[PDB]
């Protein structure tokens, strides 16, 4: 519910947060299933809008 | 003033909203991919259309 309440702008900055946090590989590996669960629910719930965004910055971010 | 129409895709649950007011997540009809979180007064369910006098405003909680 906490991930369903937040709008798509907060979803985009959540993706920025995940993109920064998997450069610090210390707290990536100590929170791998939490990051996986939250990130996959977020883009699975917001999949229709995410694949309609047109920005190569977010495309490179997702990659 | 030009008005816009927006179909409910998800009635948001477990938000801490004030009673008689329910948050809701609507996607537009002129571009049926982008959403916005609104919060409506009467009884609402999924895939029904509601009328936004503005769409430049995300909804917070009410409480």
């Amino acid at each position: 519910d906490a991930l369903m309440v937040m709008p798509f702008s907060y979803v985009l900055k959540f993706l920025k947060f995940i993109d920064t946090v998997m450069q610090n590989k210390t707290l990536l590996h100590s929170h791998l299933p939490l990051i996986c669960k939250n990130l996959f629910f977020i883009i699975k719930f917001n999949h229709k809008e995410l694949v309609s965004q047109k920005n190569e910055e977010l495309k490179l971010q997702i990659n | 003033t030009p008005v816009t129409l927006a179909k409910v895709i998800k009635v948001l649950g477990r938000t801490g909203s004030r009673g008689g007011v329910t948050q809701v997540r609507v996607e537009f009809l002129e571009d049926t991919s982008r959403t916005i979180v609104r919060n409506v007064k009467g009884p609402v369910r999924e895939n029904d259309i509601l009328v936004l006098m503005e769409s430049e405003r995300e909804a917070r909680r009410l409480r």
């Binding site: 991930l3 309440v5 937040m6 | 801490g16 917070r60």
Partner: peptide, 11 residues
């Protein structure tokens, strides 16, 4: 008193 979702949003 916020809740989950809006605490995560402001954070």
């Amino acid at each position: 008193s916020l809740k989950a979702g809006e605490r995560l949003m402001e954070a």
